Every structure is written in structure tokens, then in C-alpha cells.
Design a protein around this nucleic acid. Structure first.
Ligand SMILES: Nc1ncnc2c1ncn2[C@@H]1O[C@H](COP(=O)(O)OP(=O)(O)OP(=O)(O)O)[C@@H](O)[C@H]1O
Ligand SMILES: Nc1ncnc2c1ncn2[C@@H]1O[C@H](COP(=O)(O)OP(=O)(O)OP(=O)(O)O)[C@@H](O)[C@H]1O
Ligand SMILES: Nc1ncnc2c1ncn2[C@@H]1O[C@H](COP(=O)(O)OP(=O)(O)OP(=O)(O)O)[C@@H](O)[C@H]1O
Ligand SMILES: Nc1ncnc2c1ncn2[C@@H]1O[C@H](COP(=O)(O)OP(=O)(O)OP(=O)(O)O)[C@@H](O)[C@H]1O
Ligand SMILES: Nc1ncnc2c1ncn2[C@@H]1O[C@H](COP(=O)(O)OP(=O)(O)OP(=O)(O)O)[C@@H](O)[C@H]1O
Ligand SMILES: [K+]
Ligand SMILES: [K+]
Ligand SMILES: [Mg+2]
Ligand SMILES: [Mg+2]
Ligand SMILES: [Mg+2]
Ligand SMILES: [Mg+2]
Ligand SMILES: [Mg+2]
Ligand SMILES: [Mg+2]
Lengths: 311, 311, 311, 310, 311, 311
DNA sequence: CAACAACAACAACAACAACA
């Protein structure tokens, strides 16, 4: 995977500066390479010449130049995709949930976003030949609606051992936006040691509705949301982990629209809209995607996770 | 239960600051740890560095990091469930009413929400081996429809002493939304000294239909409801008290929909829909739940509380 | 019982604000302690700080905290119930007509709601040891069907002097919904001087059928009805009077359903359904009650008021 | 009795506004006092402040406050009742037809409804000494069965002059369920210009069966009937006149009055007429807040209505 | 094409000076000619007389005097335009995308900016008689939204060799504003060696929203944006490449406006506004242009790229 | 017109001195007369006595003493004014664009300053009886926004031949502030040979925004702008040509302010402010003028140049 | 004494009989 920051120690860099970078949140040389000069200067005790030298030596460790489109196509041909637990949804997504990007599913209440998140979290531990990502998973839950019983049910359905799928899922709760960002920081610190494949944030904008209320607090809310989404995107680009976030809806009074403004719209790569059907059936539609045609699919949440409709 | 806020005094914090935090609403380390920096800053006489130290020591007191899913499963397997008073409904709920969450029962009038609330209030004092929670009950009532006669009848049915049942139930009445929020603040203040198991708000969204009228003040109504539900969620996560709220319905002109909107749709954890059949028989259906299948059950309200329908 | 606004003057407030509140409609410290901040702010000439100050002093005047259920039981056991003039109906209601809660009686035409209202108005003047409270009565009549000869007949049946029986009965006909609300305002203003025990509104929703017509203005009609019922409930709670209202019915076109929608259903406390029987006899059924079991009784209307059927 | 609306002109309201109100239909201060603010707003050119000011002044004009049951008892004892021409029916109703209220008479066809209406119309001209309010009658006839010959017969029976009896009877006919409302609107000016003691509608619900048909037009029919009955009640309460209306009957698949709950709840007194043997009929009180449920016997003689000749 | 800077060497200037100028970014005589004195002085190792001599030779090599308008008209008539992929859009721009200038397309999310950029990138390699520019395309992408599949689809639609169109497209990703600005130096370095006819930046102002947050950082953000746009304009004037930049949108909040401010408004030459209508159809409008009227052409994005709407 | 510098030689001045003056930038006797002693002594090879003789002879050639105000009034009535292409705007300016003075237009983007400049450039060549200046015109453009198509359209509107009108719009482009300033020397050199009546510069302060950045470079920027404006004023007073300049705008975060500071405010004589109205209609408001009062006017840029608004 | 823009969100209200 990514080269740890210890390599920078072998480039004429003092140990205390490396420790300062590590405690600032840059646990990988990729983070320092992608860091602008302002971020590397805002940390106290760092001089302009020191930051210039650090960036100069970090630029040699990772390629940041011009490459032909054929090389990019070859690189994209090795992108792992994780099955969503339904054959129809897998066909609709043309492979499944993509890694290295942000895919957000939004809809009304009880539509089935959390069930999909649970099924993805338990599925990503599967071997690659079976459609998994062959890695652990993380769940930063903000609504307190994490139920390991569903994970056990899906593990029983797929035949895996429940103990292992339980032991290979990190969990955390967010009580406020600041705690959410600190959880992202701790996830960045932790991910450098083991192999992670999924990172679920359900839901990303639940706490922003209550913490930032009113009109005069709109700009600060948008700035904080933008910083959070930028951190998520940086983590996805660095560690190559599939980031799945959940979004709510709001009324179109005088008819529902996803919340979060233009920041969430321009920060996501794939967007899915989930809507209610009849009894236990739900409909998924590709709201926005750079290479996926606008289509629809039908699914249902059975007693063993998400799957195809029992028609 | 939660550690009292006085422990913060043993972490180099002035007594007057702790008194200010207590008068602001925070009476435990958990409440302070769950609050963002904005809320603490909003208190007058509090500096930025002092607040940062306060949250630092609060986070040191109570863990907030990542834990394996098996630890969460072990924690969840030791959660008390309060019997609803009916065996069929107990089977439907897979244990009864769960603590630490929000259960909202809604339906038309005459369905039996108040009777269910009364039965839960009386039976939450039972020993754990009988399905109780072994704690005092609270009743914040807004419609002026609290009758101790039903509590006496259920106490006679289960055989406990009526005097102790009446003595171990706190009651209060709400005349407007502001008084409802102040009652919640007083409940937070008084819950830290004794052990409480249930907290009933019937109805949660009854006054909001009258105080806020018209399209002009819809946003203010939604914001106030969101703040009230956030306070309820904070109380539930703090003291581990089973919160039961009651909701009404509205007619779908051009056919009944629960009032409150997306705020109460997303704030609640478990939702039950109660409908009227014939005679004294009623039908309860699980509307929204993260780990409970959509099913139905039949019950009735006899002379001694809610129970199974006579066949 | 109620404490006039004058007591606020000795608590720090001046006289101009007291006069302004009296103009607004609050003639009691209880009535001003039951109002939200937005209601007092709407009175022009009152500042936010002044409103907070007066609300704090009013909350200091009357208790609004948490009380044990045993205290509520003691308070509830000392309320007065007024007999309806029939032994069967008195047994059915387990005491008669309560005070402090809304009792709605509905049925088809010719059924006999107005006779019951007249008999209750006469009985409202009986000594407390004979079946009724000790106070005067009112009659807001919106159909022009107030017949004093029935009052004289019932007073002769029980045995009283007709002069003071008729003297202690207010009356005011209503010609429109706005006039009805202004009549309620005048009743609230005038109730503080003397002792009142019955507030009859017959019919409560008779003018709403004609004043508001069509689907377009249904929401405004419902909002106005909700405001009227909220004012009625506030008056009943503040002055401790027995409010009795009458309601009409409509045919359930593909069979009688009371009019008023969910507002009247959720605003009332005791609902009775009166139905024509055979000849002169009628049957009264408990439609809805939080503590009275669903039963029915048999009665009639003789030449001297309502009473038990003669067999 | 009623105070002309011109008074409102003198207290600070433009004459144009008073003329507009008179055009709308409010010919009396009482008429504009009994109307809600919403109704007054619907008139174009009337502002919120102007409507509030005129409503407040009108409320200052009329005593809309709270009274005592003794005063209402004195007011009730000061009303007049009009004899129906039969002693049995006179004693059945404890007098006659009370003014300021609505009396609906219904039954099967050919049961002496129009005969009773004619006798009541001719009786209201009597001096108070022998019943009647000493006024003039109005006949809004919808069925077309108004014969100006029974009136002469009853006038001859009572000894009154025929020409004066026939002179003061304002007759009009309605052809659909839109001319009735316009006739009622026009009746306000005639009632404010001269004393009127009886308004007769026969039948109240006759054209509604044919103009409105099917389930689709049921709601509109009920709304229009409610508006018509509300206007009738407003006129009765305003001008202190007695309204007598005639209602048809419908079979049951066993006869019940038509009109639904609207006419049942909008009528104060209800009488049911049934046929017996020969030329004898029975009148029974259906719904009444004070009169007990009883029956009386009456016959339609060759001269007028009255007690049966036995 | 542009004359390489080596022609200066045989003009009286030292080769070391030419190398020093080369490392600064001036790889062409045109770049040195279009340079103020301070720009050529701030580079170390350059004297005043030496800079004056270099500027004198640069002015001698490149004509900078007045010219009759007919010659400019002829030169404008010899300007190549790149087919946009739609016939009505080609009619809208009176040809295609102009070369030697800056065109900026902006709109809300999922409106078709990236699809248009991809279609232009593949179309630029067409022979000059089919509307192409007969060169190579460069793609600087700042959102990770480059998909070679769309390029392959459009190449198959136009009957090209997919391998060649993949081999003749250069790609780069910008992880921060500094990297985005520094990519242009490499772009200029690699543009002289071969023939390039299209440079796409998508998006130009995406990273400035998050990197430069708050209010105190507004002036620095505007200065950096101005420098970046000036460098883009210098590239366009130097190598005669069609520069296509992408711009986002922002809400007004007491209704959407492009971001960037007056700098982007005045720097760009042609401005296009793209909006979404119904289904798969979009509307394109001309916002700012010196010689094109305000029209509202209409198009769509099918599986083979941009194209005409299907009725 | 102005007397050429070929008159000081036949007065006792060596031809070498005249050649030196011509090289320095002074091509007419008036330019040397207006040159102060400090400016002329800066020329290499010029002594104090030679300079004194030169200024003495120049002052002898052209009068510089006091003139009675009626002579100035007579000379003021012999000033040509150029029509702006709109009759209403011509009425607003009371004749048109005055010669021998500096006019400035500023506004937001797409407001229509370049269109007005093009219309003035093409109409300047009209005969005097039609409102033209009878002379040629020039165009020093900095943004590369010169489009001969608009000139051809207006020439078609006025009926003049396209080739003849194109052959007299000698145009140049400025790539930096130094080049923009040095273009004026060539403009003065070519102005003495033919008849010119326009010196359009669009825009004057475009390059100064990016060439000079930061607070440290403010004083040098202001000094250079002052020198450029002084050269423009000297040219206008020398050759009697109408100088028209275009100014950008900036926002007011603490709302539009023309850029350039007090130097351009105190240098320009007539300042007009252009604003965007609705659709194709624009509003022109006179900002600053010592002769005409503040007023507003309406115009529109149709498909064939600027003109009156379409009604 | 000069110069620099940006940020969305919130649901609710029932009613009308008739035909051998
Ligand atoms: N064991 C189960 N078997 C079948 N269906 C289930 C089961 N558990 C939950 N469900 C279904 O899950 C649905 C709700 O899904 P989920 O909790 O994921 O909603 P969500 O919209 O993502 O939640 P939220 O927005 O409130 O966070 C319910 O309608 C219910 O039918
Ligand atoms: N002692 C009793 N015995 C039997 N049934 C009873 C008794 N007391 C109340 N009920 C029943 O309670 C029912 C009403 O239920 P409940 O009082 O809980 O109201 P609810 O549906 O919660 O309505 P709301 O709170 O909106 O007024 C009635 O139908 C009545 O039959
Ligand atoms: N003096 C009396 N003696 C006996 N019965 C009487 C007497 N007065 C009225 N009634 C009875 O009253 C009954 C009607 O009751 P009431 O006047 O209270 O009507 P209501 O249905 O409440 O009125 P509404 O629906 O029109 O508002 C009639 O059936 C009649 O028999
Ligand atoms: N001159 C008369 N002498 C005796 N009886 C008469 C005379 N004129 C009419 N009648 C009687 O009048 C009765 C009909 O009464 P009336 O004309 O009032 O009908 P109605 O019940 O009002 O019916 P409709 O529904 O047609 O209005 C007949 O039975 C007839 O015997
Ligand atoms: N293969 C495809 N077939 C049809 N339409 C497609 C296909 N791929 C993407 N789309 C369409 O592309 C649209 C989004 O356009 P695009 O990807 O160019 O985004 P954009 O608005 O320019 O945003 P951004 O700059 O954030 O990428 C979607 O609405 C979708 O309908
Ligand atoms: K939920
Ligand atoms: K000036
Ligand atoms: Mg969920
Ligand atoms: Mg209840
Ligand atoms: Mg009644
Ligand atoms: Mg008739
Ligand atoms: Mg894009
Ligand atoms: Mg321009």
C-alpha cells in the first residue's frame, strides 16, 4: 500500500519534525505530498525553508506529473468493486461499489440505506473472487442505529464465520460534528497499520441539521461540511478505501431534495436515490455519475440482508 | 450510572466554572463530553482555552474512540427490555420496549396510546426477572389525561402495593412548548440523583399544532421540535432511560399520516402504528425499525390495563 | 382560586404593563403563566427582557415543577362532579360531569342534547351536598334555542325559587365564529369577578359549517377551530369550570360521523354519543374516555327535564 | 324595529362605502353587525382597517354583550304568535306561529300544506286582539300553486275587506335554485321599507330535486341549501319576522323529509302532516325545543282551515 | 509554430543566461517578449543591462508594433475552431470552440460540463477538414472525474482508432492549488516539443473553495486565481491552444451565480451557461461574448457523447 | 495641425540636437514647449545653455501667456464632437465625445464598453456634417477583444465601404504594462504624419491588476499609472485627439468601485458609469463632468452595434 | 492612502343523500 512516513526519515529530515507531521495528521508520505504549503506552514515550529525541503523530497517519492491516458486506463482496469448483495443492483452499478471514490445514497426514512450499509460492511470481507474487497471495514455511526444482528444474519447467509466478521469491523459513534471530524482523524491514524476496504458514515449530515441551526450559522455550517468532505476525499485518495456516506432529504415546500447544498453535490462522485415501493420492495436510481447511465433497479431487504425482490 | 460533574473538580477546574456548567444544564461528565465547543462557548464567562481544557479532560474521563463490533454486541446483549403488558406485543417487539432509544407510538384517537403509556409506567417498576426495569417512572403529560386509577388497577393486577407504585412515579404537566423544554431541563436535573427507567412524553407534538400555526412560522416550529428531540436523545444516551413519546395523525386530504415531518421521522428509532378494529380489539404494526421485521399483532385494553385480546 | 393580575404589581412590575395585559386578555396570573414567549411578545409595547422578567415572576407565583403521583391523586379525589339529572347517566359517568375538562356530546337531531344542557344549567346551582357545584352558570347559544321555560320546569321539579335560579344564568347569542371567540374573551374577562361552574357551548361547530365552505378554505377553518378549542381549554384549566359543548353529525356517504375532524377529537376529554331510541326513550353511549369503560345507559326527557326512563 | 344603515354613514364612513354595503345586501346596521369580517372583506374596495372600524362601530350600535336569563324571559314573553285558524292547532302549539323563527311543515302530497300557508298568510293581517302581528305577508311560491281565491274566502269568513286583504300580499315566483336567493336578497329592501309579519316559502326544497341530480352534485346542493337557509335565518333574526317553509317527503326502500341534516339542524320548529279518513288530517310536532310531542286533528273546510266539524 | 528560445543564443546572449531563463519557465522567445522588466529581473543572476539586451533582441525577433485592421481580420479568418459535437451548438458558436482564447462553461451539478470536455478532447484529434484541430489534448482534472470509457465511446462513434486517441491524450491530477499552478510549467515545457491543440482544466476553481476558506483569506485567494488565469492566458497566446476551463456555481441565499468573482469574469473571453431541463435534455446559453448574440441552443448527452436532442 | 519639430533647426540649433529630441520622444515644437527643464535636461548630451535656448525658442514659437476668456469661449465652440452611435446618448453628452480630453467608461463585465469603443472607432471616420471626426482611429487593446466583425456591421449600417473603413483602424496589442506604455511613443510618432482622431485604450487598468500585486508594489503601480495617464494627457493636448479609456471594477466586501485609485479619478476629465438593466437594455449614468449635470440614459447593443433601445 | 466574496431550509387540512 502507501509508503509510511518513515521513508522521509531517510531523506535528511530530523526526527522531531517527522513526529510533528505525524501528530498533525500526516501519517503517510502521500498526505505530505498532497498537502499545500499553507497546511504545512500552519503547524507551529516549521520554517518555510524546512517545508520547502520536505515538499521537494516528498515530490520525488510519488509521481505527480503527466501520464498518457492508456496508463490511466490500465490503472483503472485494476480497481476493485464490492458487490452490494443484490445481483440487480450489481448489474445497475456495473460492477458494484467502486473504491477510491465517494458514493452517497439518499432517500426518505425507512427506505433502506442502513441495511445496504450493513450488507456492504459484511460483504467487503469476502475474497476478491467472490466479489469482496478482501479487507476490514469501519462504521462511524451518528444515529445509534448500528445492529450487529443484521451482520450476523448476512454472515450466516453467506456461510462465513460470525466471530471473524464481528472481529474485523471497527465501530465508533459521533455525538457532534467536532467528534465526527476527530473520528476521521483517528481513522486516518489507524488505517496506516492494517488493510481497510470500507468506511461507512451513516449519516454524514445528520448532526449538521441540529448543531448548526438558523440562517446566520449557514456559512460556518457549509465551511465545516466542506472541510469534512475534503478530509474524506483525501483519505479515499490516500488509502484507496471505498467511502460510503448516507444523506437525508428535505421538503420542497411550495417533492423532496437532498440536504447539504452544493458542497455535498460537488464533492460526491456517485449518487444513488432510494425510494419506497410496495410492502418490502424498494427502487434505486442513479442520480448522478460520470460514467453510469441514468437507470433504475428494484431490490428488497429480506430476513438476511439486502437482495433481489421476491417476485 | 453516569459520573457526577463534580469529578471534573478533581482535574484542575475552578468551582465557579463547574457551577456555571451545572446551571447551564450539564450535570455529568457525559453531558459535557457530548457537547460541541460551540455550546460551551455560548455560556458567558467561559474562555476558549478553558473550554478546550474542559473537553480534553472530559474526553479523557469517558472513552470515545473505536471499538470492535464484538464489544458492541456484548454491550447490546446486556440491555434491559421493559414488558409492554401483553405477551403478544412482547413477542412482536422481541423483548418489549428497549432502553437507550426512542419509541414513538402513533395513530388515530381512541387507539389506546395513553393506556399503553400508563401500563408501561406502572410495569417499569417490576423486578428484572418479571420483565421490569427496577426504576422510578416519569410522566410529562401535555393533554391533561393522566389518571392514577389505571395505575392502581394495573398494580392490583400484578399484586404490588399501590402506595409504593404511586410514590415512585413523578408527574408534570406542560402548558406550552417552552414549558415542555423547561420540564426536560428539570428532568435532567433531577435524574442524576435517583435511578429512573422510563420517561413518557404524551403527546410529544400536541402543543406544536396550536402554538405554531400557518406557513409563516413552519421553520421555527421545525427548529424547536428538532431541539426538543435532540434534548430527548441526549437524555436517553446519558442516563439510559427508555423514552416513549406519543404522536398524533393528520388526514391526507386529496388516509392518515403522522404529524411532525422528517424531523420526527428521522429522530425516532422505533415506530409503532396503532389502529382500531372492532369491540375493544386493536392492532399494532411496526412502522420503522432497524432490526425488527414488519409484522402485526393484536391486543386489547381490559379493566386492568393492556393485555391480550380475549378469544 | 385564581389570583388576579394585581398580585404581579407588588412583585416588581408596574401598572401600565398590567393594564396592557388586561387589555390583551390575561385577567389572572395563571393565564399569563400559561402563555409562551411568542404570545406575550405579540402584545405591542412589551420588550423581550420585560417579557422574560414578568414570565419569571409569574412562574415564581404558581408551581410548575414535578409532583409525585400521590399528590395528583389527592388533588383529583377532591374535584366536584355535577349530576346530569338522571340516575342511570350519573352511574354511567361514575359521578357525573367533571370540571376542568371538555365534555362533548354529539348525535343526530331531535336526540336531546339541548335538554341535557338545560338540566345541567339548572343543576349547576344546587348545593354541593345534593349533586352539583356551588356557582353560577353560563350559556353561549349559537342556534337560538335557549328556552327559559325548561329551566323553570326543572327548578320546580327539584324545588327552588325561580327568580334567583334564572338570575344566576348568563346568556349571549352568537351570530358568527368571530363573535363566538369574542364572547369567549368576554367570558374570560367576566369570570374572575364571580364564581362560575358551567360553560355551555351549543353548538360548538354549527356556525363553522356555513361560515367556511368548500375545500379551499378548509385549513383556515381548522386553524380557527383549533384556536377556539385551545382558548376553551385554557379557560377550563385556569378557572376550574365544567365546559360542556355539543356537536353535530354527518352521513358517511359510501352511518353517522361527528364533524370537526381530528381537532375536536384530540381536543376533547370525554365524548358521549347520544342516539334516539323508541318513542321518548334515548340511549347514551360513552364514545371516548381516558378512564370510563365503554358502556351505555338508557334515559328519557319528561315534561320536567331529563331523567331515567319510566318503566 | 331595525335601525337603517344610514346611521353608519354619519359616524365617519364615506357615503360610497354605505352605498356599496347596501348594494351587497346589508340594508341594516344589524345586518352588517351579524356578518363576519371575512364576509365584509370579500366586498371589493373595502380595506382591513375600514372593515375593522365599521365592525367596531356596528358592535357599538347593537347590544351584543352578555345578558341575564330574566331579560331573555321578558323578551320571550314579549313576542307575538299568529293563530293558524284552528283551535286544536292553536292549543297544540301553545299559541300560534312564533315570530323570529323558522317553522317547517312537511308531509306527503295533498295533506293541506298550501291551504295552511294561505290561511296563515291571510291571518297575519288581523289585529293583535284576535291573533296576528298586524303586518303584510310575502309569498315566495316555487310550485306555482298560489290561488288568490282562498284568501278571499278566509277574508269573507273573518269579515275583513277583500281589497285590503289582497292588496298587501307581496307575491313572487322562483323558477330555479338561483332565483330564490335573488328573491330573498330583494326582500330585504321591501322589509326595511314597510312592516312585514310573515314570509312563506312553498316549497323550500322543491327545485333542488331536479336542478341538482346524482351523487356528483350532492355536495354543491347541500352547500347551496345551507347558504339559502342561513340567509333565511339571518333575515328572520334581523327583521323579526316569522318564516314558514314547506318541505316535501321521500320514500324509503316509510316516508322521511328531504334535505338531509342541513334542513334538520337549520329549522327551529317542525310539523308533520298526515292524512286520515275523508277530509280529516293529523298534525304532529316532530322536533321542538319546548313544545312536547303531541298530535292534533284538523280539517280543510270549503271556506278555510280549522277544527273538524264533528 | 513558436520559435524555440535557442534562437536567442545566436544573438549575443550567453548560453548560461538562456539556461537560466529556461529554468524560470520561458521556453520560447514569445514568452520572453511578453514579459515585464520586473519579471525578468526577479530571477537571480540577471543584471539590468543584460535584461535590457535580452528584451531588445526579443522585441527585434517578434513584431510588437501597430498593424492595419485588415491584417488582423485576415489572421482572425485563419483561426481554427474545434467541433463541439452538436450541430446546433456548432451553429451557436459560429463554428466551434475558438483557439487562442479562453472559454468557460459553468452550471449546477449534473449538467454536462465534464461530458462536453471529454467530447472536445477526443474531437480535437480529428483531421482539420472534419472540424478537428489536428493535434493532441491535455486534461488537468481536479476532481478525479476522468473516464477513458467515454473517450473510447466517442472514438467508436466517430470511427477512430481507440488506441491512437488514448495515446494522444495527456492526463494529470491536481491535489491542491499549488500543484494545479505548478502543472502549467510542465504543460508549457511539454507543449513546445510537440503540437498541442486543446488544454482542459476541470475544474479551475474547485480547489479554491476549500483550500482558501474564511474571509481573511479572500485577498490571497483572488491574487492566486489571478496569477493562475494570467498564466493560462499566457499559454493560450504563446502556443495557440484552445483553453477550456470549468467553473462551478453557488447559491444566492436572499438564484445561482458562478464562483470566482470579477477575476474569472474579466479573464475569460467566452462564457457558456449550462442548465438541466427535463429527462436527458440540457440547455446551453451564451453569457459573455464579444461577437456572439445571447442564444439558448439545446442539446443532450447520449451514450456516444454530446449530441442533438431526440424528439 | 501641430507644427512639426522641423522649425527649431532653422533658429540656431544644431541638427544633432533636433535628432536627439526626436529620438527622445518629442516630435513637435509643442511637445518640447510643454516639456519642463528637468525632463529635457535628462537627455544625454544636452547642456544647460542648450536647454535654455530650446525652451526660449519654443516659448517664442507658440504663445503661452494670458488670454481673455472670450477668446477661450470662441476656441471652445470650434471643438469637434464624435457621435456615440445613439441619438439619445448624443443628447446626453450634448454633442458627443469631446476632443482634446480624456473620457473614461467603467462598469461590470458584459455591460458593453467594448461595443461602444468599436462603434466610436468606426464612426470617427465619418464626415463632420454626419457627426464624425473626419480623422483616422487607433485601438490599443490589452484583453485581446478586438473584433473587426462589429466594425464591418456598423460600416454596413452607415453605408461606408468595408475595405476603406478597415484600412484606417490601425490596431496594436499590449502584453504588459511596459509594452502598453511604450506603445504611446510609436503612437505619437505615427500621429504627426497623418490625421488621427481617436486613441481608444481598452482597458487602461487591466494589466496593472496582475503585473503589480500586493501592498508592497502599490506605490510603484500608482507611479506608473500616473506616468501613463500623464503621457495620455500630453498626447491629447498635443495632437487634439479624443482619448477614450476603459476601467474595470472591484467589489466592496466591507458595492462596486472603479479601480485605479485617486490617480485615474483626478486625471480623467469625463467619467461615465455603465450598468446592466434588463435583457438587451443598458443604462448609462454620468459619473463626473465639469460641464454636464448628473443624469441617466438608456441604450442597447443590438445585432448591428450600439444604439437606441428597442421600444 | 488600494484591494478583495460567499452561504439553504421548512408541512398541513374534511365533507356530503336519495329513490316504487
Ligand atoms: N429483520 C428484518 N427483516 C426484514 N425487514 C427488516 C428487518 N429489519 C429491518 N427491516 C426493514 O428495514 C426498514 C428500514 O430500513 P433502514 O433502518 O435501513 O432505514 P433508513 O431509511 O436507512 O434509516 P434512517 O434514515 O432512519 O437512519 C424497515 O421498513 C423494515 O421493513
Ligand atoms: N377502564 C376502562 N376499561 C375499558 N376500556 C377503557 C377504560 N378506560 C378507557 N378505556 C378505553 O380507552 C379507549 C381510549 O384510549 P386512550 O384513552 O388511551 O386514548 P388515546 O387513543 O391515546 O387518545 P388521545 O390520547 O389522543 O385522547 C376508549 O376506547 C375506551 O374504551
Ligand atoms: N316539554 C316537553 N316535553 C316533552 N318532550 C319535550 C318537551 N320539549 C321538548 N321535548 C323533546 O325534545 C326533543 C328534542 O330535543 P332537543 O330540543 O334537545 O334537540 P337537539 O337534538 O338537542 O337539538 P338540535 O340538534 O336541533 O340542536 C323532541 O324529540 C321532543 O320530544
Ligand atoms: N275549495 C276547497 N274545498 C275543500 N277542499 C279543498 C278545496 N281546495 C282544495 N281542497 C283540498 O286541498 C287538498 C290538497 O291540499 P293542498 O292543495 O294544500 O296540497 P299540498 O299538501 O300543499 O300539496 P302539494 O305538494 O301539491 O303542494 C285536497 O285534498 C282537497 O280536498
Ligand atoms: N454513459 C452515460 N450515458 C448517458 N448519460 C450519462 C452517461 N454517463 C454520465 N451521464 C450523465 O452525465 C450527467 C452528469 O454530467 P457530468 O458527469 O459531465 O457532470 P458535471 O455536471 O459536469 O459535474 P462535475 O464537474 O462535478 O463532474 C448525469 O446526469 C448523467 O445522466
Ligand atoms: K429510523
Ligand atoms: K474631474
Ligand atoms: Mg438509516
Ligand atoms: Mg393520550
Ligand atoms: Mg339542540
Ligand atoms: Mg303546496
Ligand atoms: Mg466535472
Ligand atoms: Mg472590453
Amino acid at each position: 500500500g502507501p509508503q509510511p512516513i518513515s521513508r522521509l526519515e531517510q531523506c535528511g529530515i530530523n526526527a522531531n519534525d517527522v513526529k510533528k507531521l505525524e501528530e498533525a495528521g500526516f501519517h503517510t508520505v502521500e498526505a505530505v505530498a498532497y498537502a499545500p504549503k499553507k497546511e504545512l506552514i500552519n503547524i507551529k515550529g516549521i520554517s518555510e525553508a524546512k517545508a520547502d525541503k520536505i515538499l521537494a523530497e516528498a515530490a520525488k517519492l510519488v509521481p505527480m506529473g503527466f501520464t498518457t491516458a492508456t496508463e490511466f486506463h490500465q490503472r483503472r482496469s485494476e480497481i476493485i468493486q464490492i458487490t452490494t448483495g443484490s445481483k440487480e443492483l450489481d448489474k445497475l452499478l456495473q460492477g458494484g461499489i467502486e473504491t477510491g471514490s465517494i458514493t452517497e445514497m439518499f432517500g426518505e426514512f425507512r427506505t433502506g440505506k442502513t441495511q445496504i450499509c450493513h450488507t456492504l460492511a459484511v460483504t467487503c470481507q469476502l475474497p476478491i473472487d467472490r466479489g469482496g474487497g478482501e479487507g476490514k471495514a469501519m462504521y462511524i455511526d451518528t444515529e445509534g442505529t448500528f445492529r450487529p444482528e443484521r451482520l450476523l444474519a448476512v454472515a450466516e447467509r453467506y456461510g462465513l464465520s460470525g466471530s471473524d466478521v464481528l472481529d474485523n469491523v471497527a465501530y465508533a459513534r459521533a455525538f457532534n460534528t467536532d467528534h465526527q471530524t476527530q473520528l476521521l482523524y483517528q481513522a486516518s491514524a489507524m488505517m496506516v497499520e492494517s488493510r481497510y476496504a470500507l468506511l461507512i458514515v451513516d449519516s454524514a449530515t445528520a448532526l449538521y441539521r441540529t448543531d448548526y441551526s438558523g440562517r446566520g450559522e449557514l456559512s460556518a455550517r457549509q465551511m465545516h461540511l466542506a472541510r469534512f468532505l475534503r478530509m474524506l476525499l483525501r483519505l479515499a485518495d490516500e488509502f484507496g478505501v471505498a467511502v460510503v456516506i448516507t444523506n437525508q432529504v428535505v421538503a420542497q415546500v411550495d417533492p423532496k431534495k437532498p440536504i447539504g447544498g452544493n458542497i455535498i453535490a460537488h464533492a460526491s462522485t456517485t449518487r444513488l436515490y432510494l425510494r419506497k415501493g410496495r410492502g418490502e420492495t424498494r427502487i434505486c436510481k442513479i442520480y448522478d455519475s460520470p460514467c453510469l447511465p441514468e437507470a433504475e433497479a428494484m431490490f428488497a431487504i429480506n430476513a438476511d440482508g439486502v437482495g433481489d425482490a421476491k417476485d
